[PDB]
Amino acid sequence: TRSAVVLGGGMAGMLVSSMLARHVGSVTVIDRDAFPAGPDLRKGVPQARHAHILWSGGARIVEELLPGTTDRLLGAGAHRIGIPDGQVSYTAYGWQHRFPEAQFMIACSRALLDWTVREETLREERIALVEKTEVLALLGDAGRVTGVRVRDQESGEEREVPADLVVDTTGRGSPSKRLLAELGLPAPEEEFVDSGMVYATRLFRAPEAAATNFPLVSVHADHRAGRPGCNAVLMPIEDGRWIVTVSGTRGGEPPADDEGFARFARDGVRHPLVGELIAKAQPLTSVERSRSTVNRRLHYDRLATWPEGLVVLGDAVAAFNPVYGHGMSAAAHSVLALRSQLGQRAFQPGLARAAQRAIAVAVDDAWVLATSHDIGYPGCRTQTRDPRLTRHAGERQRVTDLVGLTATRNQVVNRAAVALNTLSAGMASMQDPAVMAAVRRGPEVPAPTEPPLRPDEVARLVSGAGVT
Numbered sequence: 001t002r003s004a005v006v007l008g009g010g011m012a013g014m015l016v017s018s019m020l021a022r023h024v025g026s027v028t029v030i031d032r033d034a035f036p037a038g039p040d041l042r043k044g045v046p047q048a049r050h051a052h053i054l055w056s057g058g059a060r061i062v063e064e065l066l067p068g069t070t071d072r073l074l075g076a077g078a079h080r081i082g083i084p085d086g087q088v089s090y091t092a093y094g095w096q097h098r099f100p101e102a103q104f105m106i107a108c109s110r111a112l113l114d115w116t117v118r119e120e121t122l123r124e125e126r127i128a129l130v131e132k133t134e135v136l137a138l139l140g141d142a143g144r145v146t147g148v149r150v151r152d153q154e155s156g157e158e159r160e161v162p163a164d165l166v167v168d169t170t171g172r173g174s175p176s177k178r179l180l181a182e183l184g185l186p187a188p189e190e191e192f193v194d195s196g197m198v199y200a201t202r203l204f205r206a207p208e209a210a211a212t213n214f215p216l217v218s219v220h221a222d223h224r225a226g227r228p229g230c231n232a233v234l235m236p237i238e239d240g241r242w243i244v245t246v247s248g249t250r251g252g253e254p255p256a257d258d259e260g261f262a263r264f265a266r267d268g269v270r271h272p273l274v275g276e277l278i279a280k281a282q283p284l285t286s287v288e289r290s291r292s293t294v295n296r297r298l299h300y301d302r303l304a305t306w307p308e309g310l311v312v313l314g315d316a317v318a319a320f321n322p323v324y325g326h327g328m329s330a331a332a333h334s335v336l337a338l339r340s341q342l343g344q345r346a347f348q349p350g351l352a353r354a355a356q357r358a359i360a361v362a363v364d365d366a367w368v369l370a371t372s373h374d375i376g377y378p379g380c381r382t383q384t385r386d387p388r389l390t391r392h393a394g395e396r397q398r399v400t401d402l403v404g405l406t407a408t409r410n411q412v413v414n415r416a417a418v419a420l421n422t423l424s425a426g427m428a429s430m431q432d433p434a435v436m437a438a439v440r441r442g443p444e445v446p447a448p449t450e451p452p453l454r455p456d457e458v459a460r461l462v463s464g465a466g467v468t
């Protein structure tokens with residue numbers, strides 16, 4: 001009984017459909033893209049050409065909604081990398097000492113993650129993916145949405161797909177601003193923090209011995225330095241490859257040419273480690289860039305009026321600067337927020353509004369973590385009324401910088417910091433008295449003076465082939 005229509009069959013759409021199919025009789029997913037029968041790139045998810053980190057907070061939720069996905073990913077060559085034990089990270093405050101595991105991440109191509117997640121979701125035959133289909137209009141009116149009018153691309157035929165609940169998960173390029181205007185809703189407040197960040201990515205074949213058990217390697221900008229923020233991330237993915245993504249805010253953008261890529265990874269960032277490691281590896285693709293890096297949020301939950309039966313989640317409601325790596329975990333948290341309101345309110349009037357509000361809460365930590373560190377860069381453009389980002393942003397940042405500094409050399413502060421940064425704990429968790437006590441206790445290990453690489457990791461950057 002009852003039906004859902006989900007707009008967009010990407011990460012948020014697949015997760016939300018798996019959840020919804022446990023609460024409604026059927027789920028229909030509408031997408032204008034064509035979907036490959038394998039782990040390939042597709043036009044509807046262009047961001048898949050860049051490094052994607054799936055933090056524990058999101059990965060645990062993916063596993064809860066689609067049990068077995070983690071093992072299927074690992075069986076397909078994805079890597080489970082412990083945090084901080086499995087990462088070599090030059091932070092704004094120095095090298096992170098590699099304490100024992102506190103959290104983790106899953107490292108693989110976004111194409112593989114999407115394929116795996118889609119396959120697992122569609123094992124439920126009550127979920128149907130309708131490809132190559134345009135979304136023309138929401139059915140109903142500003143008081144209640146009752147489905148969607150769609151158009152088949154190949155035939156051109158239009159039909160109405162009924163729904164008790166429509167969920168827009170069409171991503172950063174969502175047409176809901178248009179769909180909701182034509183439904184007769186007021187325009188939502190648009191909030192953004194635009195550091196002008198640009199990505200550049202090349203794929204590499206790792207040295208053969210380093211195809212597994214290799215760390216996540218990141219060189220971070222110093223958000224406190226009045227200069228463009230540039231980063232470099234090297235991430236293992238399946239089939240013995242490394243995805244390397246470099247990034248820079250306004251005035252420090254990485255170049256488009258293959259030669260400038262390696263120079264940026266050496267000299268454009270604060271430490272050349274990633275540039276050093278890609279010099280061991282074989283490039284496989286030419287530089288691809290992306291400017292889809294603005295933190296942008298639409299406050300649908302604060303509209304004066306909202307239709308029954310409509311919810312927007314994922315990048316369609318809040319999108320982030322990807323350097324912090326939260327988007328997929330924010331969407332997963334947002335799916336559980338909808339599930340929470342479904343369990344509390346079933347389909348009574350008030351469901352959609354309460355879910356939209358809960359989704360606003362769900363994305364708030366990812367939103368603050370990204371925007372708090374982007375607002376300071378030279379030439380950052382902002383449109384916000386959030387006092388946390390302006391008036392007393394410095395005080396919020398003074399505490400974050402003290403936590404961030406102490407986390408590099410104190411295990412208890414690190415454990416709390418990585419719980420928050422993986423979206424495994426809430427923002428307030430850091431004000432726990434015991435955390436602030438550890439912060440005041442300060443460092444328990446010396447600051448590393450060199451990249452904290454293990455001998456047995458560096459040993460695997462060479463084959464030893466030309467040696468009798």
Ligand SMILES: Cc1cc2nc3c(=O)[nH]c(=O)nc-3n(C[C@H](O)[C@H](O)[C@H](O)COP(=O)(O)OP(=O)(O)OC[C@H]3O[C@@H](n4cnc5c(N)ncnc54)[C@H](O)[C@@H]3O)c2cc1C
Pocket residue numbers: 007008009010011012013030031032033043044045047050051052053054055133134135169170171172173174175199290292293313314315316322323324325326327328329331
């Ligand atoms: C460069 C870059 C790097 C990133 N790195 C990370 C990372 O490390 N970690 C992380 O967690 N997140 C990362 N993200 C964010 C992540 O990609 C998104 O948060 C995530 O894909 C959001 O999922 P979604 O389902 O909301 O949208 P998407 O996954 O983009 O899916 C949107 C879907 O809607 C469909 N669609 C779009 N428009 C229409 C339309 N008009 N009609 C019908 N269908 C439509 C598309 O075909 C697609 O299937 C990164 C993003 C970028 C750009």
Ligand SMILES: [Cl-]
Pocket residue numbers: 046047048290291292
């Ligand atoms: Cl992109």
